[PDB]
Amino acid sequence: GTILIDLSPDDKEFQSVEEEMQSTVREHRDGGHAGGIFNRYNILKIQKVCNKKLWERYTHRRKEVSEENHNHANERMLFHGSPFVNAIIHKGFDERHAYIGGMFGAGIYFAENSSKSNQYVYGIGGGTGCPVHKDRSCYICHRQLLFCRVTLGKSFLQFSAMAHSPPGHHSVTGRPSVNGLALAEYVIYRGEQAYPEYLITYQIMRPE
Numbered sequence: 001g002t003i004l005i006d007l008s009p010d011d012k013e014f015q016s017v018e019e020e021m022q023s024t025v026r027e028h029r030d031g032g033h034a035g036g037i038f039n040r041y042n043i044l045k046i047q048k049v050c051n052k053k054l055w056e057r058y059t060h061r062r063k064e065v066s067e068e069n070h071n072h073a074n075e076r077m078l079f080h081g082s083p084f085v086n087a088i089i090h091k092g093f094d095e096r097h098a099y100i101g102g103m104f105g106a107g108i109y110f111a112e113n114s115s116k117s118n119q120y121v122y123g124i125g126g127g128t129g130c131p132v133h134k135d136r137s138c139y140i141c142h143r144q145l146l147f148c149r150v151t152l153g154k155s156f157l158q159f160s161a162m163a164h165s166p167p168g169h170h171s172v173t174g175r176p177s178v179n180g181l182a183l184a185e186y187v188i189y190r191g192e193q194a195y196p197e198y199l200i201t202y203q204i205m206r207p208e
């Protein structure tokens with residue numbers, strides 16, 4: 001039931017999604033090993049993901065969470081990178097999309113930094129890089145990220161350098177405690193708590 005609608009680059013909505021992508025790139029402690037070496041992207045396409053069943057699944061869960069948290073869903077727009085973004089946009093998020101070995105347990109992980117999500121496009125740790133050239137820093141191959149609407153509800157704060165949410169919480173927030181420039185990462189434990197709103201197709205750009 002999924003339709004993808006291309007946004008025009010002239011559309012304010014294209015522009016605001018692109019700005020969130022570009023503005024949340026940071027350097028990574030791996031020197032670019034997982035995600036590649038870059039400071040910015042070449043955005044090739046931004047598509048709106050339209051699926052009525054999946055949207056209704058999300059909004060149902062959002063109301064459940066809101067009612068458990070003083071009418072506050074604590075909804076964010078966050079990035080998600082995975083080799084399975086094509087499955088997600090058709091079928092939704094579920095346990096097959098969980099990072100079993102994540103530092104906050106087996107859940108579905110999202111990032112404020114688009115470049116953090118970029119590290120997972122080709123698998124955990126970047127896998128073996130792009131399928132065509134086996135290059136984690138490939139500047140040629142098209143990559144895709146999701147920019148997702150995520151319900152955090154009451155989030156458990158973890159200060160740090162499918163399972164269940166911590167009791168009394170709907171998510172976990174991984175707060176950076178060493179790298180002063182890193183943004184937060186978030187984990188949900190129910191696929192219904194995220195909707196894959198935008199599919200972004202892009203390349204990383206080689207620094208000059």
Ligand SMILES: CC(C)CC(=O)Nc1ccc(-c2nc3ccccc3c(=O)[nH]2)cc1
Binds near residue numbers: 079081101
């Ligand atoms: C079959 C197996 C490989 C499933 C899996 O672990 N997939 C997986 C998908 C996405 C991510 C992921 N992990 C993150 C961790 C922190 C911040 C963002 C992300 C993010 O955008 N994606 C990790 C693992």
Ligand SMILES: [Zn+2]
Binds near residue numbers: 131140
């Ligand atoms: Zn490549």
